[model samples]
Target: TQRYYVERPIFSHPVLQERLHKKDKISESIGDKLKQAFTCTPKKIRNIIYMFLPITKWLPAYRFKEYVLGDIVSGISTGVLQLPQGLAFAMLAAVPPVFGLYSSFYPVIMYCFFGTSRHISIGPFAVISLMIGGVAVRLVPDDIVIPGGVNATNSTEARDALRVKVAMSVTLLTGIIQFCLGVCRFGFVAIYLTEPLVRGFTTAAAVHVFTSMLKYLFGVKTKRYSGIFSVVYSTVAVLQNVKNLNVCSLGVGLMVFGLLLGGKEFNERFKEKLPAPIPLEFFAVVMGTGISAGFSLHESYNVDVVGTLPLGLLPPANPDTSLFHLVYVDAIAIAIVGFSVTISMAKTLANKHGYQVDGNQELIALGLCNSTGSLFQTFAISCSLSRSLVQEGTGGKTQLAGCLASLMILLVILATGFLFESLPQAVLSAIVIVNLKGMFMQFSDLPFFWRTSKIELTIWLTTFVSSLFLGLDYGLITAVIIALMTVIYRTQSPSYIVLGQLPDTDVYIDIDAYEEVKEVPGIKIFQINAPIYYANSDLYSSALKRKTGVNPAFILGARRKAMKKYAKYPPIVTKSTLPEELQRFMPPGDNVHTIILDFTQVNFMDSVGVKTLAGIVKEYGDVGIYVYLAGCSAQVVSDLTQNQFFENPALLDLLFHSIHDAVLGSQVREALAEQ
Candidate 1:
């Protein structure tokens, strides 16, 4: 009995357990919910671990024979693609290519264990690396050499040391922010970055990328530009040096872009006909490397090349934690921008294979990887869209391919790093430049968003221009704020739905739509699916009165006129129907007996909305009209009471559970009144 634990009860398993019955279908006891959570049992143990560690769920049921070959081939191809881009983006991040290799290694391998996307390739990206640039380049740069052989290299490496350290802290802090967001399940924040906003923002980022890469393309050094209005300032800087553009560097970049662009065009055109499309990334990097190594372009054209990559890897060590506070401003920007794309691409690819991709897990998966990768002196990592295409297109069945890809980069860092040492910086520039053509083509969305939603199109333009002027990091935050303002604007102008009940059911539909729903005589039903608040409280009342074909203010004025001359009434008018005496004044419509407001959409209410609602009820009542509020949520009622909406007790019984209940009650009351 006490074999497992002395104090706890023995392992006498109970096959049968008592069921907890719910007392009401809609109103179940909160205690029942609490019991299910705290219900201690042996069977629930395995479920807890499997949910948190997703790899455990997928890996244990291995169909290795069916999936392994495709996974390995896909992984190798994905790795081949990652190599040049990772190094290319380092120049974007203003760090060395060696650290770029480290980024292509650690974060990717870590993703295999914690990430759930069966097809997504997680690694470095253009927008995220630019975000890293704004941070890593923010601190002044002087660098030290890893080789330690050259005297001038000391100051060069020394400057790089501080910049790379700043890079490390920014990445680490970003991971913490993302990892915390994941644990708290803040992945729901992804909703704020809408599709239109996403396209607009990345298009603005293309502007930033082109401006930043101007020097690399022309082989001219210009002052680093960042922060407020840096986008325009940097582009302007390049124009002053237009005459000094190294012709050799310009020629090399032009040819690479032309070849790569046309090659991709051909691949896309004949993708269905070809067995497998040409491995463009592999061919591009190899040709650029060989041409430079043989011709020595860096010596003749004076173009910068990725030079002398250290064959030996550094021991894993920590970045300075003291640098964290100095870096959080950027860490927040990078965290969200990178996290947005990773989730977007993972979701896009996951939909193809029908595997569930968790936003929270995506966050945590990248967070853990980047946090670990930064310890090895890597910059920030995110999902590369082009690499994602490669991973998914190449038949990668599982993250097993991701591991193999990371190992391929691992082998290059140890041995083949020398091969690409003389690779043209202009060629890397072309690689990024050619990739940006896709973003440039997003200009066509101008008419697309315009034809659909004018408001959405305005948001897209606003997002694009703001980020373009303010720079990507500031632009994104401003665009998000602008996007939210549009939400409030649209919400304030909600659809004033006039509802009609069907012939024999509790179901309701728009009165003007289908011919089947006849409006009940002496009754009106109205609803608006928006939170009731001060901003639109008056508008709500205005629409409510106009749509229901009743005006309480006008009726009240008419009643006041009738009251003024009550003592000297004319004898010519005989005793008449109800409220016909007041008809002498403004002559309002007297047919409406009940107005039922379907408040199923009103989940939240403020003081003004509640006060306005209460006044409408009392106003209509003064003119012999009845009002009913149906389907108010508990929180809506709570908000009403909290705002003293029930201070006048007569209106307290105005609530109805369903529209038909109000109909039946009002019908009974009208029936009894005739007696």
Candidate 2:
């Protein structure tokens, strides 16, 4: 009785009253609309907050007691590591050391607050630094030597400013491009830098970086070589300058290298005796630096030390807009290198940590950091996996670790950087040399690539050689072009195979499956597997020609020619299996009819693929051989928008979704025709 007496809904607000339609006539949709209006305000605010600081949404739910202490510890350790790395990367980029500090600091702060990834430490990285140097040298002309009162021409700083200006502008432009790409969800573009390419490029860049440091290390500068061949040639040509080699510096470098390796080995040896949990890598780096410093002092070496890394906290950077034009001018190349390196590092770390890294969000965070950091005099920045792995193994749980690491660097710069002045540059170069040793290991992969795919090996080799000589940026660009072209080339000239049924089985396989086969009369089936494109338009023509007996002798002739060429070695085929009789009945001699196309393996077809296929169908139909299509995958039909390919009234009766149905229908049609 109480339920039967339904209370009238109260509408107190003027807006609600206005929106309240004739109560009895209103549908359920009206109630849903009202509910949405009531809940949308808080949701909108939350969405806006998420749009800016995505990390904020997750940070609140994470308990400080559970994660904060670990996060802070990780952060401190990372700060220590970033200090040394920041200096080295900046020097590599040919930028002043302070720019490296700037790069390490602001970007981390921005990403810590805004980024989606938990542990991506945004900063300067090795490959990107090398890329910036390469691009800058190429785009910026060699210094213009101005004729002075003396016989020799003095170098002008005037043209230098233009290069700087252009570089900075390029950086801004690159940031904008990245921002737009993220906004448009073009995150997949990162996939273009495949693992093999990345490995090869990084290794090659490491070599370049090492060679570049030779001048700073031993003080025997080689003339710059823009190409891989020239770099080697120049390095070899300048080797005799060994007379000017800074043995004191080289000794320091060798000592540091030995210390690093020895420390790592010592840590591993004593790990079982050590405390419950101490990070061996962190210990190794600390011990290595300490040992190197001690050895330099003991040997009374005249080698330069990372002479007094500047000490104290850095004030907020305010890069002069005018100075940006003079420096950071090759910003676009820097940004490209930066984005690729950082995103790659982030993803690599994510893989190690067993989590999915958001490529789009990572892109957004990086672009924002670079754009905003530019105002703070930060040069192009990216992530480094080596540091991230150190942090990860040491229990880093948040991006705060990176910011803390930058802070630690700032403190060092403020208080003790003067000591770096005495630190030998060769020691740093030694660190680089140790890393470069890993790059040379790619030789092991050559045989692997050679066996996997010869064509792909060619592309990889081409890229490697180009990168080695042409400069990193140009080499990478060329590799990308080659990769894209290779894809096109593969798809364009598809491999169409004549398929035959397996003995006592429904499955059909290529005719070359000579081990087992069954013979059926007259009907011919050809399959095209690769997606059709302009490159493979001729493949369909050839396929149709073979199916209708136009080139009956072609396959047999090809097989015979192939056999003859390798006859001197050995024969893989037997005379009994040879198609000697089939060759005489082949097309160009007798008319063979009835062709079938097996499309089961084709999952996708572009417009080019569809057009080429339709053209083949039309041609076969015109010949009165009755072309039949079978095993068209669902996606293939869904992707085909062309009416002629999918929905044409003329073709609708011929298209079948399965090869079995098509073949059976063909047999039935033939029988009916005979009746």
TM-score against truth, every candidate: 0.81, 0.72
30-83: candidate 1 lDDT, tens digit per residue: 658766576456556667555556787778887888588778778877887788
Candidate 2: tens digits of C-alpha lDDT, residues 1-675: 334453433221222326556547656677467565555588788986776568767667776884677778777767756765677776665555656777787788888876766666667776566555555566566665545556654543444443433434444555666677677776677778665666566666666666766765674555545444645765675575767665766765666778766755564456563232233323434454565577764256454444434445545443335434444445555665666666666665676668766667777778887777666655567776556655775577877677678677666656655545445555566555554544565666679888998666777677777777876667788877887787777776667777777764556777776857553456777788775555665776676575545442464565466556554544321112233333333234434355677777675777777787777665545434567667665577666654346553445556565554556566777788789
Per-model CA lDDT versus the true structure = 0.78, 0.62
- Candidate 1 least-lDDT 10 residues: 9-18
Go through the candidates in order and give the clash count of each: 12, 49
Candidate 2 global lDDT: 0.62
Model 2: how large is the Cα RMSD against the reference?
A: 13.6
